[PDB]
Write a protein that binds this DNA or RNA. Structure first.
Ligand SMILES: [Mn+2]
Ligand SMILES: [Mn+2]
Lengths: 437, 437
RNA sequence: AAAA
């Protein structure tokens, strides 16, 4: 005998159970996962899919007992099913983690176990995981254990316990544009990093709006069909005074030219110090081989590799593993449901920090992109996950956004942090400070 | 003499305590609002402002006692602060609503009061408001009191208990564009309503994309400067055929011309069957008085008035009161925080149904508008608010968006509803269905 | 994990 059992209340947030289970798996022998059933008459769904995922990812196997509850808000039907379905075996210690579930479930499961085992002088203990100071507090023993730097979770386990699948991500050694600009990516990335670190981001993004996007963006497949481009180029020449081609050749700053001249000669958007305008001998395949990949990277993809490279320094010194706790280009889906894409993911302990990146200074576009990162990390990491939005907006607008999209969760620490264009140079440090503090 | 007390555990969601308080305020002469203090060192904010608002709108005044809990995660510190600060007065019935607060609070308060009032001179009772079935279940009593159709909240009170101020909404008799298009708004709306009922939505939207949003919405202030515009007109005219100007003058369906000519004479975008092309000596203020308000209302505001008029009738049949339970163009702010804008608001009992309207068929733009309406109704009405996003997408895209952004709250009823283009003509009954099921 |  001498069996020790752990009773977990399984709600719609599975992460708090996973953390407590990992910390107490060894010191207990059997596990009771109290979940819920589906009853559309009472508008109640089931937390069983989370209970299956908690059994699998904690690897409790057959040492796990599933206790179903028919009504999560009916005191009578809770205690009824409890006596009829709680294990009849003897135990030396009965530990309850009432962190999840309803309040009804919590109240009636706590008092029932208190009067079924603690009534038999069998060790009884309650526990609740603080989502604010990251501690597991014991009711009777009065112990407060911080599981912040002890319990660790990865991106695959975190999304699977939240019922997401097909988890794809990229690494420092598997970035897509490392292949598109092979034997030249480091040079292009180094040059851009210099300018952004030199507080030239506002100037770069301005140049990206005019003329970069005035010339290289328009009709779909503008840069994959020469005819569309050549017609587009001639139309811009007709604008004369307001022509972006004139501004590209003449008013383009030098740090831009250095970035452009960093691209491989076969994939340069410039003809020395002027805009490369293809002739009638240049085919549609030649254009995409030179313009498409370079334009896509300068349209916002550089800002993603920048932030990921800026933060990679502090992370490797914090002994965090790549592909497990940090990565880029995160994609996943629910079964028979559309996919999602998060620019940068980062997991400090078990707190998921989702980072969405945009080079925009427009209020509406940044606000919606913040809206998105809040909801994704909610569906992906839980209701206690952080969302940081890095934008090209100024400090004032950035601050307003944080205030506008702020939701009271009971924690002084903010879960929605917006970073402005000024923070770009030291974004790596600014994030490290935010995430680890 | 016989002081019956009701104890409410105050959390971040204040709506449940207001609902229960409004129902049981008459049968109790004392009220204890257990609220949290602010200790930044333990990452814990104060729900005092939420409990303050409840005392005001429930008009408890002197019958209200405030009990500050220093730590809302430590069992020991909870009970210690309780014994130290709970009213030591004589009570004949002690009723606890444990629907809110942290799990630890709901269990340790429950059992602290249950023992402090075990003497049969004092009768103990416990309540919980089930958000799923909208009922007030009583502990140990099979009694089931539904409050779905009994308790009703006004839009000003709901935003006030969630800490928002400067609540401004427009109703039927005070629509802004009804004052801007004088003696024509009824004819403009009639033509738009008539066309939508004739399955001409997609038609309008496609014309709104091209050539409408290519002639009047190409530059950030082209309808505020006559030069930019005539420049924009000539820049489109450079294309000759396939220019947005030609499609307007030629390939423009008749029901569009009917709406365009329904506008007041001095505020029409057309000059016969052609696009009035502003000539020289047209002031940037004379241009504004003609195209500015017409372009804005024709860019989508029309969809907001359409949906509002279709729902207005259904609701009046019911008891919903305009301005008190439904309305259009709601704006409000938290103190020293930016304002928000929800297109249409509705309150079915005490449930906030927020409706965001967009005439777009693009999945990205609609997706983003979905994250917005979800986050807004949770800040404005609480975590049990429904969001509805009436898009211009087809049934396939709507069901995909509905699955992409859906979060698991624990209810078998949807809380994010994505109506599509085909639902437009019967949006009145469609909304009546989803809101009052 | 402060109306699951
Ligand atoms: Mn992005
Ligand atoms: Mn809208």
């Amino acid at each position: 005998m001498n069996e020790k059992v752990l009773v977990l209340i399984v709600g719609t947030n599975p992460l708090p159970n996973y953390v407590v289970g990992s910390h107490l798996k060894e010191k207990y022998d059997k596990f009771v996962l109290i979940y819920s059933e589906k009853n559309d008459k009472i508008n109640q769904n089931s937390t069983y899919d989370y209970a299956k995922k908690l059994k699998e990812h904690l690897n409790l196997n057959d040492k796990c007992i599933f206790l179903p509850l028919s009504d999560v808000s009916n005191s009578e039907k809770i205690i009824n099913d409890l006596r009829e379905k709680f294990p009849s075996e003897d135990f030396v210690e009965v530990h309850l983690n009432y962190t999840g579930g309803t309040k009804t479930m919590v109240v009636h499961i706590y008092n029932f176990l208190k009067e079924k085992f603690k009534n038999n002088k069998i060790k009884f203990e309650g526990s609740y995981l603080d989502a604010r100071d990251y501690k597991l507090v014991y009711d009777y023993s009065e112990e407060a254990i911080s599981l912040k730097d002890t319990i660790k979770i990865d991106i695959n386990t975190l999304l699977s316990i939240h019922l997401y699948e097909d988890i794809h991500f990229e690494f420092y050694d598997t970035y897509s544009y490392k292949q598109k600009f092979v034997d030249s990516f480091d040079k292009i990335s180094q040059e851009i990093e210099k300018a952004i670190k030199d507080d030239k981001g506002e100037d770069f993004v301005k140049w990206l709006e005019d003329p970069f996007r005035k010339i290289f963006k328009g009709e779909n497949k503008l840069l994959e069909k020469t005819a569309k481009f050549k017609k587009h180029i001639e139309k811009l020449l007709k604008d004369n005074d307001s022509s972006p081609i004139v501004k590209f050749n003449e008013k383009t700053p030098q740090f831009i030219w250095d970035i452009l001249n960093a691209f491989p000669e076969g994939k340069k958007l410039n003809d020395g110090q002027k805009l490369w305008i293809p002739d009638d001998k240049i085919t549609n395949d030649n254009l995409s081989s030179r313009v498409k990949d370079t334009v896509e990277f300068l349209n916002g993809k550089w800002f993603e590799w920048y932030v990921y490279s800026q933060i990679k320094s502090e992370l490797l010194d914090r002994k965090l593993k790549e592909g497990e706790h940090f990565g880029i280009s995160l994609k996943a889906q629910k079964k028979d449901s559309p996919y999602f894409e998060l620019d940068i993911f980062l997991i400090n302990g078990y707190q998921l920090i989702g980072i969405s990146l945009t080079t925009s200074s427009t209020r509406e576009l940044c606000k919606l992109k913040g809206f998105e990162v809040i909801h994704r990390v909610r569906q992906i990491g839980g209701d206690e996950s952080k969302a940081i939005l890095i934008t090209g907006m100024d400090k004032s607008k950035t601050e307003d956004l944080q205030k506008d999209l702020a939701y009271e969760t009971g924690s002084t620490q903010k879960r929605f942090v917006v970073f402005g264009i000024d923070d770009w140079a030291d974004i790596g440090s600014k994030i490290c400070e935010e995430v680890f503090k």
